[PDB]
Design a protein around this ligand. Structure first.
Ligand SMILES: [Zn+2]
Length: 210
């Protein structure tokens, strides 16, 4: 089988809900997918979803479920300079991290205290967001999903309009998504980044500071 189906099955194996995506539109198959952050899809849907994936459909992982939040950093290099290699390697040593198809990085973690909604952006630099926190009613594409950049017609894509396909891949190794003190982490990120001029967004600071 492909890597897309292997990993999709891995998430289902671990109790996570997944949602099909990407053919024509590049959005979930269901219009009411947001509900999968709060409930299971039902067997007679789960299998339908797999078949779609086993046949070319990418898939996504909704946040919120099981305390899951995904920190979606626009640039893996920026985060490297932001918190230093050791910190990064530590973070992505204890929990699942993946490479995005545009040079970014997704850090998956579980937490007892997470936002009720996604926070976009979580941190900002020189007036722009450099990382989104995906939680309830939001998602991230899953490992194995691939994108043909031929259809990316913006500069947000480093491979703009090239006939080239890349996929969401493992940052290092496959590991279970582990628990963290999200707030402790957002604070560690805060300090570590204050020197670079990277600050919590107002929405992020209000959820953190409470
Ligand atoms: Zn692209």
């Amino acid at each position: 089988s492909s890597e897309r189906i292997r990993y999709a099955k891995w998430f289902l194996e671990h109790g996570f809900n997944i949602i099909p995506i990407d053919p024509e539109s590049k959005k979930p198959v269901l219009k009411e997918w947001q509900k999968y952050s709060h409930e299971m899809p039902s067997d007679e849907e789960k299998q339908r979803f797999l078949k779609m994936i086993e046949e070319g459909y990418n898939y996504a992982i909704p946040g919120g479920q099981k305390g899951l939040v995904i920190l979606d950093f626009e640039s893996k290099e920026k985060l490297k300079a932001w918190i230093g290699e050791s910190a990064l390697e530590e973070l992505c040593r204890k929990t699942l991290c993946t490479n995005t198809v545009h040079g970014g990085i997704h850090i998956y973690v579980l937490s007892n205290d997470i936002p009720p909604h996604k926070i976009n952006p979580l941190f900002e630099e020189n007036g722009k967001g450099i990382i989104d926190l995906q939680s309830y009613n939001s998602y991230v594409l899953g490992l194995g999903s691939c994108v043909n950049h031929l259809h990316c017609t913006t500069d947000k894509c480093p491979w703009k309009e090239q006939n080239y396909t890349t996929c969401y891949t493992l940052y290092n190794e496959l590991k279970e998504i582990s628990k963290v003190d999200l707030k402790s982490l957002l604070r560690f990120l805060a300090e570590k980044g204050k020197r670079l001029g990277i600050t919590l967004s107002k929405t992020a600071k209000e959820w953190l500071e409470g």
